[PDB]
Point group: D2
Chain length 311, copies 4
């Protein structure tokens, strides 16, 4: 019989398991729930909350066959993405899930997403940080909350799911992530000021100038299509002035799906390929927190570290 | 036999047509031709005034446009055109008409044919066999022929062996003389909510007099409750800045921030919200009238409660 | 979809006909699940059929049995949930739409891909949603609830044998979608009568279902004509195309001349049927096989001449087809 | 595979008929369309069939005609596009996959929902893409190209009679998707032999296609047992269920007794049969389409094999048409 650790970090799902007979069925793994203190709305999470969860998995790693992280949907994809970088040589499944309706409210999805995450962690283990939602397991660092009001809340726009649940559970033929074998390594992080700039008609040089001020180590650009911005010379020079001061400037697509393929490149900007804002932001927290020079971080942002981008 | 006007504004498309089932059409090549990534809000104005000049002498309008900001233009034209009595269809291509496997020919042919034969008196975006309400569109798929989505509204029309109008609820629609609303430059900020965002971002925009702030918030419109954040946002509204709360999510409806003077943008796209703000800021309306108008369905861009 | 008052506590009748949901006791499982008993949920009464059936073993007589059950309890409840096996859920939902006229209360067919007894069951959530919908969104048609969508019954088929999304409505959007909120879609209404519920009964009808496939001969239509048939459904290619060889077209004209109702459908999941006409074949527009088979059982069970049935097959009686 | 672009390829186009051409009209239309003659496009040769056929009128003999045409021209060209009516495109693609052993060159079936000669035709783009894919992405399978996707032929059905997205592959992802770039998908390969192309004959075989539906009688299986059956395809419910009626199960057991190959499929668009009918001699068709199962039976019944060998072969993945357990 497998044993699954459940980190109950907060979220809708919690806003009871004993009174439901399905959970204690013989076919289920054993599981234990740790209720965090305090419980958090995932809208209130900081990057240090990613650290608390990573260290909680680290404490429990040896004594469980897998890990379920119960979490608010608002930032679930950021947490999943962060854990993927912070965990290295992961040898057990870590599945983040939650609910769009609280377990306490009628028609809650919370019971069914938790039961599925527990069953899948035990019986179809995949040694990656994954996100289970509405009968699909996704690579955590490929996810976004796409549908604010839907039970199918999460998408994986640039990658098929890893696993689908119907009458049976099927592992899909999705290409595996680069995967280290060895001792689990858990990478701590420390606060990093990062700006997120959306490219839109009538954006000014002033925005890039503002972030440069004193307080930012990296800039994420949400640019058009395959990575275009207006060719405004003030804008470009601001971006060059950013990279000249060692700021890591990364070009993403504002589009739900697709790949940046770039100039901005002349202005020191690094392409983020098909990375989500969630993967890019967390990967920056990860790399900035390490003993790495600006140029090594700039190189690593465009490489596939944990399956978050297509080379 | 219908006559369709084609504004060739630029874009990928330019970097069977004359056979008898087709409408007559005329192409106006803009000077200069523009990559849509280079568009400013004054380019929306130039297109609206071009449609105004040609309105009386054509049965419909096709706007040829780069894909990068097609949804922004479509969205802007929907506000700027009032009491529209003929179809305005924005389209283009993911591959240049000049490159192999181009979608340009089939998107243009379709847009001309639909403008002539299935007119809908709205600013629409035709792409990959679907017609969408312009102010509901986003470029969702950077690399795909199905480049555009309408996440919170079904398409108005779909083309197969036959073309059918779908049963999509009609937009609020004025009858009367076409009114074309000019716009003038408006400084507007777009803030994405994410873990570890600082009050300084809102402090920065408050100090470089922006007239409006769009928040891309979590889920149904949540942000972290950090008192410094909420305070800077309140300071912005105190100074008369229009702060509108949208979902960063592809689909759904926004539902403390309110206490801080922030307005709910319901299920509006960033494209709709930004262009609506250009439109309303450009008219001579109180901040309070602008704040109430942002949450009202002016042209079919949002789903009322 | 009407948004019905929640003011008073509703009473829903549950016809537990059989199906996966109750296999391994249903009533005891539901007694033990607190969500079913909350103040926001309607009161409900379960009639367990004797015997319980695997929906694979259902005959038209079972359609008749369920319609009589609804008629018997119609004045006494606010709505009806038919718990049913998935395998023929779409044929039952299609048959009820034709057999019930002047329907002034919801009838919702639902079930599960996995038994309530088994692990990872969809039965709890499909039945909870059906009950809640029947109470609060009382659409006066026979509908099918599965996987957070309410569908027009006579537009459904089981499209996904292994999926929790088992049912599709290929030629009509859903009536309603469930998320954080329950959203009514603006799908236009079916024809509606007025007054007390009328059940149009059925009696056995021999009906053949021919698939058109390359190498099918005129001896197939001759074989169906050979003893047991009053109607032939053709699952034709694309928009209603069949071999145009004279033997095949003669065989069909001979069938129609003997008063066999021949109906041309697409074998395709979606689309609309647009020679065969001159051979007496009637176009079934965008109808499913489930809608067409059940419509024929309804129409053939009435004292109608062949011409009247032919005409009625191409007409939208209950929302099952899209008129030109 | 992403094939080399170094030498100008030569693609043979079998113009069998279909919506695309509705003599000399196709070939003249393509002459007049500059897209087709650019440097980046392969050279191509059109063989226009006489007569051209509506795909609705196709029989197994037509599958054989097309297979002989490919074999006759195999060494002379780098690849084959089969231009075909949509109505039975999926039956032809499925039949070729079984008939063509040691296939070392792409064969791509395509066509159009709207004639090249009409307005808003999809024929231009489906055929241009097919040619360009055959030359540059030379997958050694019978494939079907429609609406920017390349599918495994023996996994397809015409799902959408009115849509430009007419074809689906309900149980297998596409092999390739076309956008700004051409993306190859992770889809695992079919079994492949080695050496010269071998064409297995497919002949006429009396095969019945039974839809299971409430009220179906034993008389249907008795009817088919009259003559037109060496094989019977059951379109059963869900994961392969049928009524438990003793007479029904008797007639099926009787058929398998008389050497009739009885194969159980789902009537559902997607999913997999899971097998009683097994005790009645019925063979499970796993997740095969009717198109793959009809053509597989034509193939095996026309081969030098006994009833037992055909029954075993029907549940085996021969060409990528079936997902093994
Ligand atoms: N999660 C995401 O990154 C989706 C999209 N690329 C965006 O810019 O929001
Ligand atoms: N077009 C859009 O607005 C999509 C999504 N709401 C975003 O914030 O990018
Ligand atoms: N339910 C259906 O009718 C689907 C499809 N038209 C078929 O012939 O099976
Ligand atoms: N192509 C197919 O076989 C689809 C579906 N299984 C049918 O029975 O028609
Ligand atoms: Cl949503
Ligand atoms: Cl690793
Ligand atoms: Cl102007
Ligand atoms: Cl894309
Ligand atoms: Cl208006
Ligand atoms: Cl109630
Ligand atoms: Cl070539
Ligand atoms: Cl269709
Ligand atoms: Cl050899
Ligand atoms: Cl399935």
């Amino acid at each position: 019989k497998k044993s699954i650790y459940v980190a109950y970090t907060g979220g809708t799902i919690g806003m009871q398991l004993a009174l439901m007979p399905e959970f204690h069925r013989p076919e289920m793994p054993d599981f234990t729930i740790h209720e965090y203190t305090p419980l958090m709305d995932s809208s209130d999470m900081t990057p240090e909350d990613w650290q608390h969860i990573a260290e909680d998995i680290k404490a429990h790693y040896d004594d469980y066959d897998g890990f379920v992280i119960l979490h608010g949907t608002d930032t679930m994809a950021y947490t999943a993405s962060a854990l993927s970088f912070m965990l290295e040589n992961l040898g057990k499944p870590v599945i983040v899930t939650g609910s769009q309706i609280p377990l306490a409210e009628l028609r809650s999805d919370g019971q069914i997403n938790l039961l599925n995450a527990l069953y899948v962690a035990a019986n179809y283990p995949i040694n990656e940080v994954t996100l289970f939602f509405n009968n699909r397991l996704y690579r955590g660092n490929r996810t976004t909350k796409a549908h604010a009001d839907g039970f199918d809340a999460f998408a994986s726009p640039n990658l098929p799911p890893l696993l689908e649940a119907g009458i049976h559970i099927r592992r899909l033929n999705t290409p595996p992530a680069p995967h280290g074998e060895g001792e689990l390594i858990v990478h701590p992080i420390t606060p990093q000021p990062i700006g997120v700039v959306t490219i839109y008609p009538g954006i000014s040089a002033d925005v890039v100038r503002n972030f440069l001020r004193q307080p930012v180590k990296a800039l994420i650009l949400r640019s058009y299509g395959v990575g275009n911005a207006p060719q405004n010379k003030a804008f470009l020079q601001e971006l060059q002035e950013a990279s000249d001061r060692g700021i890591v400037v990364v070009n993403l697509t504002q589009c739900m799906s697709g790949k940046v393929n770039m100039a901005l490149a002349h202005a020191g900007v690094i392409g983020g390929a098909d990375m989500t804002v969630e993967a890019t932001l967390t990967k920056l927290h990860y790399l900035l927190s390490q003993e790495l020079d600006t140029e090594t971080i700039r190189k690593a942002m465009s490489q596939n570290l944990r399956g978050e981008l297509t080379p």
